[PDB]
Amino acid sequence: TDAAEEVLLGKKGCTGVITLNRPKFLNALTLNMIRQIYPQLKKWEQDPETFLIIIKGAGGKAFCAGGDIRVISEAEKAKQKIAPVFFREEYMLNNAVGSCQKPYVALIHGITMGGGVGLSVHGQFRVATEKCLFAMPETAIGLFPDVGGGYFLPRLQGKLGYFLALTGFRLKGRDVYRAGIATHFVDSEKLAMLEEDLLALKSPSKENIASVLENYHTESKIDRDKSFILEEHMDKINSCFSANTVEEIIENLQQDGSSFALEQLKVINKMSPTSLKITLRQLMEGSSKTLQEVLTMEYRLSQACMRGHDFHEGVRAVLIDKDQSPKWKPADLKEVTEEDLNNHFKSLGSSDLKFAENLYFQ
């Protein structure tokens, strides 16, 4: 047996199967994996013998915990940078998933966060199990909810996505479905059969695929009639998170004064202030952008963030030392100025992320 690849690509029946394959690192997405997945997705779109693409994670704990931001941060320490290529090609793959010309099913069993969400939420079908653990945890690490977070987050109900984006709130299991992040829910004990039945389909249409998913979804039992964990908080979320500045959101939470609001206020106050301001503007702007436009914006954001202090500090606090004790700079929201913010959003000119060759554009 040769050494295992970081992602497996296979053809089984009518289906192309992508298996994220770094389970010891929670299947975190690398440039190597992106560069295998992206061209394969494009080939399968044009392959008349491929009717379905499934993405899944190896190991049963994680679908994918994120893009591999540890390695990106390490690479920032010296001259062999990875960030310019990584974010560009990652975002190109999120767009490819979102515009996929064949049915695309993501089996989001297990931890599904950040980059892992980018590989799933934009696809046509996302199947959660009771073990699905969703978050966009980027404001805790000095980044922002990228991989198209600026597109999908504002499009969740009310201001749910703004709440998720700013606080990194975790949703588990059937709540991932209730939130609209998963399209379907299956108990994990039946996931293997669901996979098998999809793979066994002969020349399936999108409708054939949808039928299989529906049939499993209907019969799943775990939390079947449980309400969405955030339903009782949706009015206050919709109110508090309607403001145009982070300072106003924090003020609204304080004035609401409920246990939940004060808990989430506490969390927000531990997030990178720069990250918070970026994230709010990103979602507000993203609310009126296409996925491509959003990704173009996020690419600018990603490169600006590499030039700041907080990303490297967040990776240290969260991923390396795990002391959950980041010292942000600036430490106060007041010191995140309008000009600083505007600088992150500036065009990169000919270095911008674009989705066609130059001759396509005026």
Ligand X SMILES: O=c1c(O)c(-c2ccc(O)c(O)c2)oc2cc(O)cc(O)c12
146 labelled catalytic? yes
Tell which positions 118-137 bind ligand X, by CB under 6 A. 137
Which part of the chain contacts ligand X (CB under 6 A), choosing from 35-43, 66-74, 126-134, 218-226? 66-74
28 binds ligand X (CB under 6 A): yes
Between 65 and 249, CB nearer to ligand X: 65
The Cα–Cα gap between 259 and 263 comes to 6
25 binds ligand X (CB under 6 A): yes
Nearest Cα neighbor of 69 from 15, 11, 141, 172 is 141
Single residue of 160, 265, 271, 318 touching ligand X by CB under 6 A: 318
349 is in an annotated binding site: no
Instruction: Please report, for residues 47, 163, 165, 184, 215, the alpha-carbon distance to residue 173 in angstroms, rounded to integers and kept in the order given.
Output: 34, 18, 19, 11, 18
Catalytic residue among 16, 57, 66, 67: 67
72 binds ligand X (CB under 6 A): no
Tell me the residue number closest to ligand X, measured at CB.
Answer: 66
Across the beta sheet with 104-108, the strand order is 7-12, 15-20, 52-57, 104-108, 125-128, 184-185
DSSP β-bridge partners for residue 233: none
Angle at 339 between CA 333 and CA 345, to 5 degrees: 100
317 binds ligand X (CB under 6 A): no
Please report how close the Cβ of residue 235 comes to ligand X at its closest, in angstroms: 28
Site string for ligand X, 96-115 (x = CB under 6 A): ------------------x-
The Cα–Cα gap between 111 and 90 comes to 19
- The dihedrals phi and psi of 313, each to the nearest 5 degrees, come to -70, -40
257 labelled catalytic? no
67 labelled catalytic? yes
Neighbour tally for 361: CB within 10 Å:
8
β-strand pairing of 7-12 with 15-20 = antiparallel
286 binds ligand X (CB under 6 A): no
* Binding-site residue ranges for substrate: 90, 115, 138, 146
Q: Which residues are catalytic?
A: 67, 115, 138, 146
- List interacting residues with ligand X (CB under 6 A): 25-26, 28, 65-69, 114, 137-138, 140-141, 143, 318-319
